[PDB]
Structure 1
Amino acid sequence: TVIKNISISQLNKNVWVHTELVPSNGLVLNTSKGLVLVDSSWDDKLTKELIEMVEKKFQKRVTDVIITHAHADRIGGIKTLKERGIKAHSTALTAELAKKNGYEEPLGDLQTVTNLKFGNMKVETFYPGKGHTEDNIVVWLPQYNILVGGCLVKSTSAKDLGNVADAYVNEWSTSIENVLKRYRNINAVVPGHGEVGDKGLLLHTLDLLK
């Protein structure tokens, strides 16, 4: 099932990919205690629309969002989250960076490895080291072996590294290796931008870094 406006695409019973317009991705987790987003959207305008679409469709509130990095493209809806009482989880580094850059601050509650449970839905967040940004994290759904790569992970259609101004192009390969070492059996990988793939996208990203 794929539902448009913003587009949402069902991966399984409780997991959806959200995509907003170039295009960027995150997840919607339909849990027994509310909806959880892995990343919100580009700005407040799209973040409000995302929230409104999912709350109406799933008939539950968005309770939590996990922010995968501090750059404008992922932090940009933070005002909307905070004023609605939506918990914005992040690492301390992501929160520091957000503040530095003039954004409202997410919680800074995520450690190198954090294990969250939302109703029945298990989520692990992992900081694998620097890459696309200094602070980039990945998000793992161990019940589904689904990895949200964020901007650490490039889609097949990405044929170059894109913008490397805030990137750490040496450490990025080690970071990707750390994800491959931690998650040896992956069913799907959601890149930051582009089509859903598998562990092949991690290998693709390694190649782009050579």
Structure 2
Amino acid sequence: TVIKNETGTISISQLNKNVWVHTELGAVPSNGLVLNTSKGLVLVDSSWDDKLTKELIEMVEKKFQKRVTDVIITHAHADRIGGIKTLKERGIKAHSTALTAELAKKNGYEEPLGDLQTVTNLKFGNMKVETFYPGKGHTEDNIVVWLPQYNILVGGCLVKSTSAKDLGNVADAYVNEWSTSIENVLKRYRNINAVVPGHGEVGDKGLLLHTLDLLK
């Protein structure tokens, strides 16, 4: 199932009962995640800007008939933190590491909570969520999100899609450290069902291996 706005700029794609992917065209798509929990809707990343983030939120709240309560920001770039203003106005908890928090205020954005640690485990009702900082890669602050109950990994901009021949913006990247960081992810999670790249189609463990090839 894939719900979209009329222009198709925003879509939510179902992976399983309570796990959906959210994609918004900024014409450049960006992937995030939506989790339907007993404590409310939990998102992995916002969107390019406030309009899209506000529309996205109204979309999911309408679908699941519940309020978005928490959002996990994987890094301090527009496609991830572009809708911080909205979150705060709406009273939504914008989770992030302390580094992402400081880089956000540096990049000229409103400051997230800065509550997440290198390894943070959060249980939203029955939905178990793990955030993991693997080291520098796409950015110095990038983190990944893991769903141990489903063995699903949200790679963010640290992971490229299967057809990707590009690495994207590397001005703020640590290209040489990137490989080691992905190796850390491969080391931490031995059985992977699906991997969600920052942009593109959902894949599997291959997306990590493919991203390493691009880095060689």
- Work out the percentage of aligned pairs sharing the same amino acid: 100
TM-score by length of 1: 0.99
The alpha-carbon deviation at position 126 of structure 1 amounts to 0.2
The CA RMSD over aligned residues, in Å, is: 0.6
| Worse-matched range after superposition: 153-162 or 135-144 | 153-162
The alpha-carbon deviation at position 86 of structure 1 amounts to 0.2
Secondary structure of 2:100's partner?
helix
The alpha-carbon deviation at position 180 of structure 1 amounts to 0.2
TM-score by length of 2: 0.96
Which 5+ residue runs of structure 2 have no aligned equivalent?
Answer: none
For 2:86 and 2:166, how far apart are their aligned partners in 1?
33
Contact 2:47-2:78 within 8 A present in 1 as well:
no
Q: How many residues matched?
A: 210
The alpha-carbon deviation at position 160 of structure 1 amounts to 2.1
What residue number does 1:7 align with? Answer: 11
For 1:100 and 1:3, how far apart are their aligned partners in 2?
35
For 2:167 and 2:195, how far apart are their aligned partners in 1?
18
For 2:167 and 2:46, how far apart are their aligned partners in 1?
23
Which 5+ residue runs of structure 1 have no aligned equivalent?
Answer: none
For 1:93 and 1:162, how far apart are their aligned partners in 2?
21
| 1:70-108 deviation per Cα after TM superposition (whole angstroms, max 9, x unaligned) | 012211100000111000000000000001122111000
| 1:116-171 deviation per Cα after TM superposition (whole angstroms, max 9, x unaligned) | 01111110000000000110000000000000000000001211222211110010
For 1:127 and 1:9, how far apart are their aligned partners in 2?
26
For 1:9 and 1:102, how far apart are their aligned partners in 2?
31
Secondary structure of 1:152's partner?
coil
For 2:62 and 2:81, how far apart are their aligned partners in 1?
23
